[PDB]
Motif scaffolding. Structure first.
Motif, PDB file in Angstrom:
ATOM      1  N   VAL F  27       0.834  -1.105   0.159  1.00  0.00           N
ATOM      2  CA  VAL F  27      -0.059   0.073  -0.026  1.00  0.00           C
ATOM      3  C   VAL F  27       0.801   1.172   0.014  1.00  0.00           C
ATOM      4  O   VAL F  27       1.726   1.556   0.948  1.00  0.00           O
ATOM      5  CB  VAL F  27      -0.950  -0.033   1.189  1.00  0.00           C
ATOM      6  N   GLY F  30      -2.146   5.234   0.179  1.00  0.00           N
ATOM      7  CA  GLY F  30      -3.561   4.954   0.568  1.00  0.00           C
ATOM      8  C   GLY F  30      -4.243   4.025  -0.906  1.00  0.00           C
ATOM      9  O   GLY F  30      -5.369   4.010  -0.878  1.00  0.00           O
ATOM     10  N   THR F  31      -3.533   3.323  -1.508  1.00  0.00           N
ATOM     11  CA  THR F  31      -3.889   2.468  -2.746  1.00  0.00           C
ATOM     12  C   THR F  31      -2.962   1.320  -2.737  1.00  0.00           C
ATOM     13  O   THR F  31      -1.755   1.429  -2.505  1.00  0.00           O
ATOM     14  CB  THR F  31      -3.892   3.261  -3.937  1.00  0.00           C
ATOM     15  N   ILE F  32      -3.739   0.106  -3.488  1.00  0.00           N
ATOM     16  CA  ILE F  32      -2.959  -0.962  -3.308  1.00  0.00           C
ATOM     17  C   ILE F  32      -2.228  -1.078  -4.970  1.00  0.00           C
ATOM     18  O   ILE F  32      -3.176  -1.004  -5.707  1.00  0.00           O
ATOM     19  CB  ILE F  32      -3.735  -2.212  -3.411  1.00  0.00           C
ATOM     20  N   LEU F  44      -7.303  -9.362  -5.434  1.00  0.00           N
ATOM     21  CA  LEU F  44      -7.276  -7.834  -4.920  1.00  0.00           C
ATOM     22  C   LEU F  44      -7.375  -7.105  -6.205  1.00  0.00           C
ATOM     23  O   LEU F  44      -6.948  -5.796  -6.109  1.00  0.00           O
ATOM     24  CB  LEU F  44      -6.073  -7.339  -4.117  1.00  0.00           C
TER      25      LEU F  44
ATOM     26  N   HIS G  15     -11.283  -3.759  -1.077  1.00  0.00           N
ATOM     27  CA  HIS G  15     -10.020  -4.557  -0.606  1.00  0.00           C
ATOM     28  C   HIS G  15      -9.260  -3.577   0.222  1.00  0.00           C
ATOM     29  O   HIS G  15      -8.765  -3.791   1.212  1.00  0.00           O
ATOM     30  CB  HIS G  15      -9.184  -4.891  -1.680  1.00  0.00           C
ATOM     31  N   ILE G  16      -8.974  -2.240  -0.387  1.00  0.00           N
ATOM     32  CA  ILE G  16      -8.192  -1.323   0.545  1.00  0.00           C
ATOM     33  C   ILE G  16      -9.275  -0.910   1.755  1.00  0.00           C
ATOM     34  O   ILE G  16      -8.594  -0.694   2.982  1.00  0.00           O
ATOM     35  CB  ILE G  16      -8.139   0.012  -0.491  1.00  0.00           C
ATOM     36  N   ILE G  19      -8.724  -3.577   4.271  1.00  0.00           N
ATOM     37  CA  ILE G  19      -7.159  -3.393   4.830  1.00  0.00           C
ATOM     38  C   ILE G  19      -7.496  -2.121   5.884  1.00  0.00           C
ATOM     39  O   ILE G  19      -6.965  -2.332   7.036  1.00  0.00           O
ATOM     40  CB  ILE G  19      -6.092  -3.049   3.883  1.00  0.00           C
ATOM     41  N   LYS G  20      -8.155  -1.178   5.460  1.00  0.00           N
ATOM     42  CA  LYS G  20      -8.272  -0.183   6.443  1.00  0.00           C
ATOM     43  C   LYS G  20      -9.047  -0.593   7.991  1.00  0.00           C
ATOM     44  O   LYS G  20      -8.670  -0.213   8.876  1.00  0.00           O
ATOM     45  CB  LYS G  20      -8.846   1.036   5.636  1.00  0.00           C
ATOM     46  N   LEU G  28      -3.790   4.860   5.985  1.00  0.00           N
ATOM     47  CA  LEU G  28      -2.816   3.869   6.029  1.00  0.00           C
ATOM     48  C   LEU G  28      -1.628   4.211   5.637  1.00  0.00           C
ATOM     49  O   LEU G  28      -1.331   4.977   4.636  1.00  0.00           O
ATOM     50  CB  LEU G  28      -3.291   2.729   5.157  1.00  0.00           C
TER      51      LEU G  28
END
Ligand SMILES: *[C@@H]1O[C@H](CO)[C@@H](O[C@@H]2O[C@H](CO)[C@@H](O[C@@H]3O[C@H](CO[C@H]4O[C@H](CO)[C@@H](O)[C@H](O)[C@@H]4O)[C@@H](O)[C@H](O[C@H]4O[C@H](CO)[C@@H](O)[C@H](O)[C@@H]4O)[C@@H]3O)[C@H](O)[C@H]2NC(C)=O)[C@H](O)[C@H]1NC(C)=O
Ligand SMILES: *[C@@H]1O[C@H](CO)[C@@H](O[C@@H]2O[C@H](CO)[C@@H](O[C@@H]3O[C@H](CO[C@H]4O[C@H](CO)[C@@H](O)[C@H](O)[C@@H]4O)[C@@H](O)[C@H](O[C@H]4O[C@H](CO)[C@@H](O)[C@H](O)[C@@H]4O)[C@@H]3O)[C@H](O)[C@H]2NC(C)=O)[C@H](O)[C@H]1NC(C)=O
Ligand SMILES: *[C@@H]1O[C@H](CO)[C@@H](O[C@@H]2O[C@H](CO)[C@@H](O[C@@H]3O[C@H](CO[C@H]4O[C@H](CO)[C@@H](O)[C@H](O)[C@@H]4O)[C@@H](O)[C@H](O[C@H]4O[C@H](CO)[C@@H](O)[C@H](O)[C@@H]4O)[C@@H]3O)[C@H](O)[C@H]2NC(C)=O)[C@H](O)[C@H]1NC(C)=O
Ligand SMILES: *[C@@H]1O[C@H](CO)[C@@H](O[C@@H]2O[C@H](CO)[C@@H](O[C@@H]3O[C@H](CO)[C@@H](O)[C@H](O)[C@@H]3O)[C@H](O)[C@H]2NC(C)=O)[C@H](O)[C@H]1NC(C)=O
Ligand SMILES: *[C@@H]1O[C@H](CO)[C@@H](O[C@@H]2O[C@H](CO)[C@@H](O[C@@H]3O[C@H](CO)[C@@H](O)[C@H](O)[C@@H]3O)[C@H](O)[C@H]2NC(C)=O)[C@H](O)[C@H]1NC(C)=O
Ligand SMILES: *[C@@H]1O[C@H](CO)[C@@H](O[C@@H]2O[C@H](CO)[C@@H](O[C@@H]3O[C@H](CO)[C@@H](O)[C@H](O)[C@@H]3O)[C@H](O)[C@H]2NC(C)=O)[C@H](O)[C@H]1NC(C)=O
Ligand SMILES: *[C@@H]1O[C@H](CO)[C@@H](O[C@@H]2O[C@H](CO)[C@@H](O[C@@H]3O[C@H](CO)[C@@H](O)[C@H](O)[C@@H]3O)[C@H](O)[C@H]2NC(C)=O)[C@H](O)[C@H]1NC(C)=O
Ligand SMILES: *[C@@H]1O[C@H](CO)[C@@H](O[C@@H]2O[C@H](CO)[C@@H](O)[C@H](O)[C@H]2NC(C)=O)[C@H](O)[C@H]1NC(C)=O
Ligand SMILES: *[C@@H]1O[C@H](CO)[C@@H](O[C@@H]2O[C@H](CO)[C@@H](O)[C@H](O)[C@H]2NC(C)=O)[C@H](O)[C@H]1NC(C)=O
Ligand SMILES: *[C@@H]1O[C@H](CO)[C@@H](O[C@@H]2O[C@H](CO)[C@@H](O)[C@H](O)[C@H]2NC(C)=O)[C@H](O)[C@H]1NC(C)=O
Ligand SMILES: *[C@@H]1O[C@H](CO)[C@@H](O[C@@H]2O[C@H](CO)[C@@H](O)[C@H](O)[C@H]2NC(C)=O)[C@H](O)[C@H]1NC(C)=O
Ligand SMILES: *[C@@H]1O[C@H](CO)[C@@H](O[C@@H]2O[C@H](CO)[C@@H](O)[C@H](O)[C@H]2NC(C)=O)[C@H](O)[C@H]1NC(C)=O
Ligand SMILES: *[C@@H]1O[C@H](CO)[C@@H](O[C@@H]2O[C@H](CO)[C@@H](O)[C@H](O)[C@H]2NC(C)=O)[C@H](O)[C@H]1NC(C)=O
Ligand SMILES: CCCCCC/C=C\CCCCCCCC(=O)O
Ligand SMILES: CCCCCC/C=C\CCCCCCCC(=O)O
Ligand SMILES: CCCCCC/C=C\CCCCCCCC(=O)O
Ligand SMILES: *[C@@H]1O[C@H](CO)[C@@H](O)[C@H](O)[C@H]1NC(C)=O
Ligand SMILES: *[C@@H]1O[C@H](CO)[C@@H](O)[C@H](O)[C@H]1NC(C)=O
Ligand SMILES: *[C@@H]1O[C@H](CO)[C@@H](O)[C@H](O)[C@H]1NC(C)=O
Ligand SMILES: *[C@@H]1O[C@H](CO)[C@@H](O)[C@H](O)[C@H]1NC(C)=O
Ligand SMILES: *[C@@H]1O[C@H](CO)[C@@H](O)[C@H](O)[C@H]1NC(C)=O
Lengths: 326, 240, 225, 38, 49, 49, 50, 99, 49, 49
Positions: F27, F30-32, F44, G15-16, G19-20, G28
């Protein structure tokens, strides 16, 4: 298991944990013993010069030092409390060492099985499978090590007998190392010797009944108390029932049929194994901390006692002259 | 330990060293030679026979193990019955394998090459279905308490067996095999890929230390031990 | 077993616990009835095998004032003016007193822990607190802290293979005392009189291991739980 | 002389490592580290 | 419990790593003037593996 | 956990593996942007690999 | 929540966002986080018996 | 002898009876000429030091400093700071709140 | 404390310091002198003699 | 004490717990009967002095 064969048969299924516990303890002890053995050493001539009687006589001084009456000289008043003396309970013991070992603080296990009286705490712990490895030899080695370190300062030569020099000559050499002395005629070591004697006397008085002295006393008392409490807790953990009818294996086997007795004993086995694991973890953590402390002590001995360090502020607050060890 | 396995009631270990109580005290060893017939009504009361290889113990026998490849060349001289079991109360049970499926509570209709279905018979009728004979049977162990182990796993159990009968041969294959009359003992066993590699008996002080340390190669050093064992002792009672 | 009150009943009212009456056949055991027990702790009533024996100086199974165990009981010259029996920190009985004459007896374990020395896969010696043979060892010597049994012919100068503190054990089984290392001494910064300067030098190599990093582990907490 | 002494010391150290208190201490320490990790 | 043990070990290894860095800087990359730091005797040179 | 078993008819061995495994997602801001996985399958919302 | 009042709501719908929610924070920091590679839904059933 | 029926001989409770309302005795030392004592005592909390099953020192927790001594299991407190309670709660009103 | 003991229902402590609730608040002390007779029907209702 | 439902019964069927009815004499206490309780947590019903 308190010697019960059936409990041992049950524990045979848990032999791996006892194997893990015992190996962790034997390896830690072996490593500590190998670093202590590597650390310590003595010298024969230095030990022959390291006593109050030798410092108070002139039998070892070279003929060139005819003016000096003895090795100790004006510093002897401060050196009588640090050097070993013949008026001590044990060999190579000084007044300060005796005061510390009395104010702050048997290894024979043959007396425990005699049965001539009610067993004390150490014998009772031994009956529970807890043995304290001998430590008096370590204390004797440490006192000999410190005595040899003290006596090596006045040793004039290494290839022959115990030829000595006056302590004032060594002090003058240290002063020259600090700064090249240019006033040979107007030497004033008397003031330094008197201040040293008064400081040593005040330190001895403080030890008999000065923030550094208080800090050292608190530290050594804390070390002793921490050593005692862990063994006390481990011993007292044997009274826990662990949700069983009793904490005595013999009582359980005398009161219940074997099928129920084994189920009752299993809980005690599990609880005692958990307690042993916790004790082992705490012991290993302490051993690592003491390893770091031992490294610091070795550095201090090498750089402040056996030589004059150039590191600023390492051997105390001020311009270091010399250090002694007890 | 080519045709020897660790007996288990559950999953089997693949690799590692374990201290376990296993039927490994060999009371007697009978080697059946090539083209030989092993027939006996063995009752669990001792195995001091003249065909035992070596010295035979006088102890009681716990487990009897047949070590041989159970291939198509193995034949029984009691017909479809491989093992005749006599249990408590004079109840006779037979382990019989056929070339055709037998219905429950029924008998074989036609009474060599193909699948074999094995059954437990009580009064000439099929009581339990055991399954087909797998092609990789290497050992059959039978305990006097009624448990059967095939390649180490307890597949079925019966009533306690007073005394058991067999009559086996290798036909014309000319293969020698073994019968072991063994008792339970504690030992350290090393296993690799579900195969026995090394066995160390805890029969001496040094062997006791080896078993306690879970290793057959002890490093030099000090080890905690017990000074003695307590056996038969008087009893003392004190009361108010 | 001792009680202050013991009653058997066929009714569950007021019962602390119950037994299980069963019928055992040749192959099965089946519970049929229940027998309820009402009991109180104490020592007024004691069950006996059938309608005060003390063995001394020998290992025995003792049941003294409700405390049971295996041990050796010995008379002592000690005098304790208070109490009946005494226990250790772990709860083990250490001694008791005879009510008739006030004589004190002490209890010790029959077997104790010992340290066996293993060199080259064989036992060469054993440290024990009891002067008795163990582990197949016959010869023995006395030390200020323990008895030492050995395969060595005791009624020595050898290299110790296994050492702890001042104690070392040789392959022949003999026990030796290890002293602190000796050295010539340190050169002092003295320029007066007769002094010695090292001249003839050889090379020594010393090995030291230091750990630098660990082996980190990542854990998926949700997958573990 | 120094080179010969160094060569002999290194050879003895290599022999000790293949199958001298410092060498034993180092081996014990590294084995203990590995075992504690496992 | 596992996390606590791991953190304690990590702190100990951090101290050991500081010692190793000091040894590398003062015994291998230079000739230290500290008495008895790079072994018992008069230090000449150090190698690392 | 069960790792494998054997078919009694023919002696064939079967192995059992979990359907889902742990992965590490990266990450940044703030993004994957990426994921490390032991299975060659999309996860994902990521396609390229 | 601040003083028993709702201030911010983050839905675990992506998904994000998952995780948060797992990290108990809406901001994050850059780094690596453990996640699951997929979810299991409707599956066949297999039974093996002696 | 306790009023609940328990008898202690040299500290050990050897036998117990029913609770005793009131007890009678009539003892003497005959011609030995020895003086002895009778103690009417009540239960209290105290720190007791024992050596060889013999009482050596008794410290009553009857004051604040004595309370600290009893809490620290020592009669010789070293100089320093110790945690204590600011007061005790005794007879208090009762408040009940329900929907 | 020559003729004074700690009351117990079990084993007795040999040495150490313990905080315990013991009958030690002396309501009254009657010293019987030499050649004296102590006779009383004492009921547990006070000892103001 | 608050409950949503509280019932007393002489039968053990459906009871969450039971009380112990006893007779106290001058020296002994003996359990004779049992009183079963069926209760639910809540605050609709409250017992008062
Ligand atoms: C898979 O699971 C099965 C079922 O649980 C296990 O079978 C058990 O096997 C053990 C031996 O491994 C059997 O144990 C034996 O029980 C016999 C019956 O015991 C009774 O009688 C004795 C007194 O005679 C009583 O003490 C006892 O409480 C019982 O009432 C015993 O006679 C045997 O004892 C004798 O032999 C042993 C040596 O085998 C000696 O050590 C003893 O001192 C004694 O001489 C023995 O203990 C057990 O009964 C079996 N259970 C059943 C239900 O049949 C399998 O072992 C297990 N398989 C594996 C691989 O783990
Ligand atoms: C740090 O490193 C220093 C050196 O830099 C070590 O100090 C050395 O320690 C060794 C071991 O103790 C010393 O060697 C011993 O000398 C004793 C006296 O030597 C006689 O013979 C020689 C012959 O050349 C003469 O030069 C000398 O004057 C003496 O007459 C010997 O007796 C010792 O012998 C040992 O072996 C024999 C053989 O079995 C035994 O009979 C003896 O009892 C004894 O065990 C040994 O040779 C050496 O002198 C020291 N050197 C220096 C320069 O000080 C430190 O030990 C080391 N520190 C640590 C902590 O490890
Ligand atoms: C060895 O074992 C025996 C047996 O267990 C112990 O004997 C007990 O001794 C204690 C005192 O040490 C006795 O306790 C007392 O119980 C009396 C009866 O209590 C009832 O009534 C009160 C209300 O009046 C209820 O609260 C209570 O629940 C009972 O229903 C009480 O009257 C006593 O209380 C009064 O006195 C004490 C001071 O002693 C005050 O603190 C109280 O506030 C109150 O005024 C008292 O609590 C107990 O009853 C005895 N048990 C039996 C079964 O007889 C031995 O003490 C023990 N020996 C040792 C050395 O440990
Ligand atoms: C602890 O240290 C103090 C000083 O900090 C010591 O007190 C000092 O003692 C010296 C003598 O030892 C006093 O000096 C003078 O000595 C000559 C000796 O001939 C004498 O003639 C003078 O009359 C005078 O006493 C010094 O004044 C004194 N200082 C103070 C501040 O009191 C003390 O002795 C030390 N304690 C111990 C136990 O060593
Ligand atoms: C019972 O079955 C086993 C197998 O489970 C048979 O053992 C196997 O026998 C064959 C033929 O003798 C062996 O082959 C040989 O392999 C080695 C390689 O290691 C090779 O060097 C030889 O030249 C030969 O090809 C095989 O290894 C062996 N397997 C084992 C595990 O021992 C056994 O023969 C069967 N017994 C009967 C009576 O049929
Ligand atoms: C371990 O160290 C020892 C010494 O502590 C080494 O033994 C020594 O080996 C040297 C040769 O390397 C021997 O010196 C002489 O060398 C010349 C070479 O031309 C030869 O002509 C002489 O005959 C003699 O061998 C020396 O005497 C010898 N010392 C001892 C005490 O045996 C040993 O080689 C080292 N080991 C290893 C594996 O490096
Ligand atoms: C009740 O029994 C106790 C013993 O449990 C008697 O106390 C003992 O009395 C004798 C004779 O007075 C004391 O002897 C003395 O010993 C000291 C040594 O400490 C010695 O210096 C004296 O000259 C004398 O020999 C003995 O110590 C004492 N024991 C104790 C523990 O106090 C007590 O006299 C008996 N009372 C009656 C009325 O019989
Ligand atoms: C270990 O070494 C020390 C130091 O050399 C020995 O101490 C000697 O002891 C003898 C016997 O009492 C004395 O006569 C010597 O004067 C001591 N030497 C010194 C330098 O002080 C000690 O005896 C040795 N220990 C053993 C067990 O051999
Ligand atoms: C084991 O089985 C064989 C084979 O059936 C038996 O041998 C038979 O013995 C009988 C007499 O008992 C003869 O009439 C048959 O001709 C034999 N058959 C063969 C094929 O040789 C043998 O007796 C059995 N062993 C035991 C101990 O019962
Ligand atoms: C199975 O074993 C039983 C064990 O009792 C055998 O029954 C015994 O047989 C003998 C033969 O000599 C008789 O003397 C006994 O009286 C019998 N005992 C009982 C209790 O009946 C039985 O014969 C065996 N079965 C087979 C088929 O051999
Ligand atoms: C306690 O001591 C008394 C003696 O003071 C012991 O009583 C003796 O017991 C033996 C064995 O029965 C008799 O022969 C003696 O006549 C008794 N002596 C007496 C009554 O004075 C008693 O056995 C001891 N208790 C023990 C050892 O448990
Ligand atoms: C230093 O050592 C030397 C010898 O190495 C000493 O000189 C000898 O002293 C003796 C004793 O007086 C004489 O008999 C010799 O003739 C001297 N030798 C020489 C060559 O002069 C010297 O005295 C020592 N110095 C000190 C200060 O002790
Ligand atoms: C074990 O293997 C056997 C074959 O060795 C499998 O049996 C087959 O099952 C299928 C599906 O029912 C049949 O069509 C075949 O005819 C069978 N083959 C035979 C009997 O030789 C059996 O299904 C396997 N067991 C499993 C996979 O659990
Ligand atoms: C009854 C015991 C008396 C004391 C015995 C002392 C000597 C033997 C045991 C030594 C233990 C050594 C521990 C370190 C590990 C090792 O090097 O083996
Ligand atoms: C299936 C996993 C294969 C291995 C993946 C390795 C790389 C990714 C994870 C790195 C973890 C970093 C831990 C330190 C903390 C951080 O900086 O984020
Ligand atoms: C209500 C408390 C307010 C804060 C009080 C702070 C001062 C008093 C306590 C000091 C604690 C000292 C701890 C170290 C041990 C010691 O030296 O006594
Ligand atoms: C029990 O005591 C008797 C004597 O009373 C003795 O002969 C016997 O050997 C003892 N048995 C043991 C110790 O097992
Ligand atoms: C105990 O008494 C015996 C005589 O019965 C005596 O020989 C022994 O020395 C005494 N022990 C002690 C420590 O007094
Ligand atoms: C042990 O030494 C003694 C010394 O007297 C001797 O008599 C005896 O034979 C020796 N024993 C052995 C087994 O060598
Ligand atoms: C179950 O298996 C069938 C085939 O037998 C397949 O079509 C179906 O998709 C499977 N269902 C799953 C994996 O959920
Ligand atoms: C309870 O409250 C009353 C007034 O309502 C007050 O007088 C009394 O002192 C209080 N009791 C306490 C605080 O114990």
């Amino acid at each position: 298991c308190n010697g019960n064969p059936r409990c041992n048969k049950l524990l045979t299924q848990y032999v791996s944990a006892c194997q893990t516990i015992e190996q962790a303890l034997a390896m830690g002890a072996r490593l500590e013993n190998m670093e202590v053995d590597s650390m310590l050493f003595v010298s024969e001539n230095a030990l022959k010069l390291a006593s109050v009687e030798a410092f108070n006589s002139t039998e070892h001084l070279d003929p060139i030092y005819k003016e000096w009456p003895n090795i100790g000289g004006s510093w002897l008043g401060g050196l009588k409390d640090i050097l070993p003396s013949h008026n001590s309970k044990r060999k190579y013991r000084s007044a300060i060492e005796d005061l510390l070992f009395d104010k702050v603080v048997d290894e024979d296990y043959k007396r425990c099985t005699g049965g001539y009286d009610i067993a004390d705490l150490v014998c009772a712990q031994y009956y529970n499978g807890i043995m304290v490895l001998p430590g008096v030899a370590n204390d004797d080695k440490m006192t000999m090590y410190t005595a040899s370190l003290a006596g090596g300062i006045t040793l004039g030569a290494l290839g022959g007998g115990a030829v000595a020099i006056p302590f004032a000559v060594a002090v003058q050499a240290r002063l020259n190392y600090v700064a090249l002395q240019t006033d040979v005629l107007n030497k004033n070591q008397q003031i330094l010797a008197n201040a040293f004697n008064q400081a040593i006397g005040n330190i001895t008085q403080a030890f008999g009944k000065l923030a550094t002295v208080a800090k050292a006393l608190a530290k050594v008392q804390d070390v002793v108390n921490t050593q005692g409490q862990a063994l006390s807790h481990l011993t007292v953990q044997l009274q826990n029932n662990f949700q069983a009818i009793s904490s005595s294996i013999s009582d359980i086997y005398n009161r219940l049929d074997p099928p129920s007795a084994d189920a009752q004993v299993d809980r005690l086995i599990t609880g005692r194994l958990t307690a042993l694991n916790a004790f082992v973890s705490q012991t290993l953590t302490r051993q690592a901390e003491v390893r770091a402390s031992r490294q610091l002590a070795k550095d201090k001995v090498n750089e402040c006692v056996r030589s004059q360090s150039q590191r600023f502020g390492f051997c105390g607050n001020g311009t270091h002259l010399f250090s002694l060890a007890n | 330990f080519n045709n020897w396995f660790l007996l288990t009631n559950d999953s089997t270990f693949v690799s590692g060293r374990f201290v376990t109580n296993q039927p490994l005290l060999v009371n007697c060893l009978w080697p059946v030679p090539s083209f030989g017939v092993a027939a006996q009504e063995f009752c669990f009361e001792g195995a001091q026979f003249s065909q035992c290889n070596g010295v035979s113990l006088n102890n009681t026998v716990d487990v009897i193990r047949f070590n041989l490849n159970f291939t198509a060349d193995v034949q029984s001289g009691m017909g479809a019955t491989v093992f005749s079991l006599n249990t408590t109360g004079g109840v006779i049970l037979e382990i019989s394998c056929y070339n055709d499926t037998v219905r429950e509570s029924s008998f074989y209709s036609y009474g060599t090459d193909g699948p074999k279905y094995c059954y437990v018979l009580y009064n000439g009728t099929a009581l339990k279905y055991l399954g087909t004979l797998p092609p990789s049977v290497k050992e059959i162990a039978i305990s006097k308490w009624g448990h059967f182990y095939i390649n180490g796993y307890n597949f079925f159990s019966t009533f306690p067996i007073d005394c058991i009968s067999f009559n086996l041969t290798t036909s014309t294959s000319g293969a020698f095999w073994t019968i072991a009359y063994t008792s339970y003992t504690e030992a350290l066993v090393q296993v690799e890929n579900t195969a026995i590699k090394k066995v160390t008996y805890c029969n001496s002080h040094i062997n006791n230390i080896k078993c306690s340390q879970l290793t057959a190669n002890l490093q030099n050093g000090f080890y905690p031990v017990a000074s003695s064992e307590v056996g038969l002792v008087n009893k003392s009672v004190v009361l108010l | 077993l001792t009680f202050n009150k013991f009653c058997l009943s066929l009714h569950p009212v007021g019962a602390n616990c119950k037994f299980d009456v069963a019928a055992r056949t040749r192959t099965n055991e089946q519970v049929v009835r229940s027998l309820y027990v009402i009991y109180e702790e104490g020592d007024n009533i004691a069950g006996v095998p059938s309608d005060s024996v003390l063995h001394l100086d020998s290992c025995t199974d003792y049941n003294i004032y409700g405390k049971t165990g295996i041990g050796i009981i010995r008379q002592t010259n000690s005098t304790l003016l208070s109490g009946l029996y005494y226990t250790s920190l772990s709860g083990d009985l250490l001694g008791f007193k005879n009510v008739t004459d006030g004589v004190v007896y002490s209890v010790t374990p029959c077997d104790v822990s010992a340290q066996a020395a293993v060199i080259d896969g064989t036992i060469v010696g054993a440290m024990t607190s009891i002067n008795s043979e163990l582990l197949g060892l016959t010869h023995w010597t006395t030390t200020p802290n323990f008895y030492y049994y050995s395969i060595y012919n005791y009624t020595v100068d050898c290299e110790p293979i296994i050492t702890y503190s001042n104690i070392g054990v040789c392959k022949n089984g003999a026990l030796v005392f290890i002293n602190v290392t000796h050295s010539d001494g340190d050169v002092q910064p003295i320029s007066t009189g007769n002094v010695t300067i090292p001249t003839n030098f050889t090379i020594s190599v010393q090995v030291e291991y230091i750990q630098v990093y660990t082996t980190p582990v990542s854990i998926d907490c949700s997958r573990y739980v």
